[PDB]
Amino acid sequence: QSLQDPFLNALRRERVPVSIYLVNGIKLQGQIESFDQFVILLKNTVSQMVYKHAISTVVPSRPVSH
Amino acid sequence: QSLQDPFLNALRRERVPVSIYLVNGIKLQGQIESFDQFVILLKNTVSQMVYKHAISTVVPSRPVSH
Amino acid sequence: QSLQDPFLNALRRERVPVSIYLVNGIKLQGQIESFDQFVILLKNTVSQMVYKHAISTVVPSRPVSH
Amino acid sequence: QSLQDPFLNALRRERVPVSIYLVNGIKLQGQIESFDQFVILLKNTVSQMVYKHAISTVVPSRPVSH
Amino acid sequence: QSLQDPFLNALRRERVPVSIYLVNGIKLQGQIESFDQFVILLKNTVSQMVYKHAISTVVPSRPVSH
Amino acid sequence: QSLQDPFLNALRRERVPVSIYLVNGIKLQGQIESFDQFVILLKNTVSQMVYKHAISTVVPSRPVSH
């Protein structure tokens, strides 16, 4: 049903450092702790809850199985 | 069903000071009083009703159980 | 079902002056005359129909019961 | 069910000159010829089809019954 | 059910040159080859697939029957 | 049901280099590896997951059958 779900899940499972680029030009970095329909929880010191509607791209720091 | 709901609820329940970053680059601060499907009520002097569609991230000022 | 509806309704009923901040950085002011699922009618000289998708926050000029 | 529909319909029926402000800061002017769920047709020389998602506000040039 | 569909269809059928203005201020030009629920295919050398969510207005270069 | 799906699928199947223009003015380039309802996976060194809501246009580098 989804390519998004298995991609994000691979990133979460493998604890791959990612860059999440926002539509406003900000780049966030961390590891994906969890996600659901509308948000991604991006972990560093604290977990930032990122609304998907604000994201342009999710870019892994290295290739991942998917 | 949701990771967003228990995260926001933990922030509300624990009265943790948060930063809510808007997609336009404004940073709001306060405590989350309540929220529903589409909005978050952010309390200081008055309660500001923030539309989720305008939010990029919600960042707690300290780690919280979730 | 909603926190948004009773909040906007309190603002409407009590005729509280509000500021409606748009995502593009414009601040509108007036009283909320009415609202529905998608829009808020903001009254001054004429009524401006404001699409919720364009709004970041609704901020009352004084605390209101909700 | 809607306040938006009777408002736009009053503007259409009465052929009131309006300003439609876009979220990007452009102001369009004309008369509303027609509208549906997602768009407003704004008439001058030609009819411009305006997506509601791009609109911040619709402001009549004079008060209208609604 | 729709005013959008017959408008776009008239533009497509009559092969009228159009300007499609994006919310970010870019103006695209061409002829509408096809469209569906979410996108418009705008033809010149190649066909550009334009997401409706990115469009502010569609403006025909001359009046068209609708 | 869709023109978007067969267009993206032709681009994927034929491995045509594309430009994906974001609403914020960034231009991404690569080949479309896969896509679903909400995202496009754009391949170069790694696969970037691009949210459709952030895309304005998808432009093939050469004409493609559709």
From Swiss-Prot, chains A, B, C, D, E, F:
Homohexamer. Coiled coil: none annotated. Residues 5-64 form the Sm domain. Hfq expression was decreased during the space flight and expression of 64 genes of the hfq regulon was altered. Likewise, several small RNAs that interact with hfq were differentially regulated during the flight. The chain holds residues 5 to 70 of 102 of the full protein. This is RNA-binding protein Hfq. Belongs to the Hfq family. GO terms for biological process: regulation of DNA-templated transcription; regulation of RNA stability; regulation of translation, ncRNA-mediated. RNA chaperone that binds small regulatory RNA (sRNAs) and mRNAs to facilitate mRNA translational regulation in response to envelope stress, environmental stress and changes in metabolite concentrations. Also binds with high specificity to tRNAs. Plays a central regulatory role in the microbial response to space flight conditions. Is essential for virulence and is required for efficient invasion of non-phagocytic cells. The keyword RNA-binding applies.
